[PDB]
């Protein structure tokens, strides 16, 4: 559970950064 | 009855001691009140405007 919550957090951060880089 | 008489006696004693303590408080207070009052009034008036220690440029 903990490992997978961290993976999902890293993906959320990478999604946000990828959107911010298009602005 | 002996317990009730002891309670009344102790009530008188702790009241007397309370009034003594309150008297000592009022005495020492009034003896120092003006000096402390002038100290707080000095430090609240001495502003010393300063930037925060981490400011840059």
């Amino acid at each position: 559970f903990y490992r997978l919550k961290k993976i999902q957090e890293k993906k959320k951060i990478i999604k946000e950064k990828s959107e911010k880089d298009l602005e | 009855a002996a317990a009730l008489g002891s309670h009344g006696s102790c009530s008188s004693e702790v009241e007397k001691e309370t009034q003594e303590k309150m008297t000592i408080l009022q005495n020492y207070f009034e003896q120092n009140r003006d000096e402390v009052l002038d100290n707080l009034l000095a430090f609240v008036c001495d502003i010393r405007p300063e930037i925060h220690e981490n400011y840059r440029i």
């Binding site: 903990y2 919550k5 957090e9 | 430090f43 502003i47």
Partner: protein
């Protein structure tokens, strides 16, 4: 001297997430500073900045985050860490889990503003604790002696009378002036009344202080509840040279507040989901027990913890186990037989007992009497475990004597009234009258000189 610079107040809440409020635009956030929060309805709250990054500050709120609002909430930054106002006048008083008074008295007029965290005591200055406290209870003063400046917890199964034992130590403990500090985390109302009433009945009010966080109070206050007690104990002991017994009730409810914060922050888990740092957090509490060089004072701790499902391998007892100078333990095997105080000696030990035991502190034999009582009681448990399978027909006569020793031992050594006070010397005379159950040559832990002087008495 004092911080003269005026405080900033921010409305710049940029998020709220579980127990955390995330301020932004903050000018130079100070890590672990306190923030006073005012809610939309005018309710005052408090918090600590548990992370900082550039313009942001992640304040954890002590009273929880219900009713925090992202436009109206005002956060006043104090510019400094959490300080406890401390003074001698904190004796005879009751405070809540955040050090606010609840005895209907005034605010604490401070002699100083000590840091809630304290500071690490310098190992060079830490005087070794060796002067013996008698608690009055044979199962403690005999086989689990307590030094002035020791930390030693009571471990309990759920529902056991550990509160009555902790009360009895505060009722009857002393040397061969002991002020008291008491903290409780997540304590039920009836137990809060029990401790408060016990101190009032024993009359020892002018030299005790209480910090109470009840089971209905906010859980995050439990992080600072024992630290307030210790910060008061450090003032009384190290600045006023008093001796203090610090009681930490329900360290399990404390550890659950850490488990809650850990889970709510996504902190890296250790065993059972407690935070990976739980050992250090417990150490920052427990290690403030001790004597120190050139000061006559001493902080002694008796923490109390109920073990979840009575499991000794649970992180709460287990990490406490590593940090403290041995354990006092209480057990259903005694309590279910009405053996108050239900202190099982075998899982119990005191790491500082060996240094406290000896001449002038105690009778010279005391170390040896203890060593043999443990051996006889241990064999007694092992022969009981055998008998339950095979009956007396497969036990030896000597094994049946250790089974009889176990019965005589619990009924005389451990069994003791809630107001019955025993010195160590009477406890050792009882210990010898139990050890006399075997022939002299069987007492294989004791030297022949000690046997020759004391065995026939």
């Amino acid at each position: 001297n004092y911080l003269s610079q005026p405080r900033l107040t921010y409305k710049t809440v940029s998020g709220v997430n579980g127990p955390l409020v995330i301020l932004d635009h903050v000018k130079f956030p100070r890590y672990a500073e306190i923030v006073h929060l005012t809610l939309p309805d005018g309710t005052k709250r408090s918090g600590q900045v548990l992370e900082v990054s550039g313009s942001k500050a992640v304040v954890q709120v002590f009273e929880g985050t219900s009713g925090i609002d992202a436009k109206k909430t005002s956060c006043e930054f104090t510019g400094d860490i959490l300080r406890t106002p401390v003074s001698e006048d904190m004796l005879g008083r009751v405070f809540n889990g955040s050090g606010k008074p609840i005895d209907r008295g005034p605010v604490v007029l401070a002699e100083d503003f000590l840091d809630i965290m304290g500071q690490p005591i310098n190992p060079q200055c830490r005087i070794y604790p060796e002067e013996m406290i008698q608690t009055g209870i044979s199962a403690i003063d005999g086989m689990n002696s307590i030094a002035r400046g020791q930390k030693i917890p009571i471990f309990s199964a759920a529902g056991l009378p550990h509160n009555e034992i902790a009360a009895q130590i505060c009722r009857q403990a002393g040397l061969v002036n002991f002020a008291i500090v008491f903290a409780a985390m997540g304590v039920n109302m009836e137990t809060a009344r029990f401790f408060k009433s016990d101190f009032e009945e024993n009359g020892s009010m002018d030299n005790v202080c209480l910090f109470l966080n009840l089971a209905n109070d906010p859980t995050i206050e439990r992080i600072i509840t024992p630290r307030l007690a210790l910060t008061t104990a450090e003032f009384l002991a190290y600045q006023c040279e008093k001796h203090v017994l610090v009681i930490l009730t329900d360290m399990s409810s404390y550890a659950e507040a850490l488990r809650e914060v850990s889970a709510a922050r996504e902190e890296v888990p250790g065993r059972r989901g407690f935070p990976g740092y739980m050992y250090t957090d417990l150490a920052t509490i427990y290690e403030r027990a001790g004597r120190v060089e050139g000061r006559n004072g001493s902080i002694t701790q008796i923490p109390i913890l109920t073990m979840p499902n009575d499991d000794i391998t649970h992180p709460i007892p287990d990490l406490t186990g590593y940090i403290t100078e041995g354990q006092i333990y209480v057990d259903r095997q005694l309590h279910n037989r009405q053996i108050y105080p239900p202190i099982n000696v075998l899982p119990s030990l005191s790491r500082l007992m060996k240094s406290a035991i000896g001449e002038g502190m105690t009778r010279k034999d005391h170390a040896d009497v203890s060593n043999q009582l443990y051996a006889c009681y241990a064999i007694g448990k092992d022969v009981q475990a055998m008998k339950a399978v095979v009956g007396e027909e497969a036990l030896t006569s000597d094994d049946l004597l250790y089974l009889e020793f176990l019965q005589k031992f619990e009924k005389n050594f451990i069994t003791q009234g809630p107001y019955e006070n025993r010195t160590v010397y009477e406890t050792l005379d009882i210990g010898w009258q139990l050890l006399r159950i075997f022939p002299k040559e069987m007492l294989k832990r004791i030297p022949q000189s000690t046997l020759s002087e004391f065995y026939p008495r």
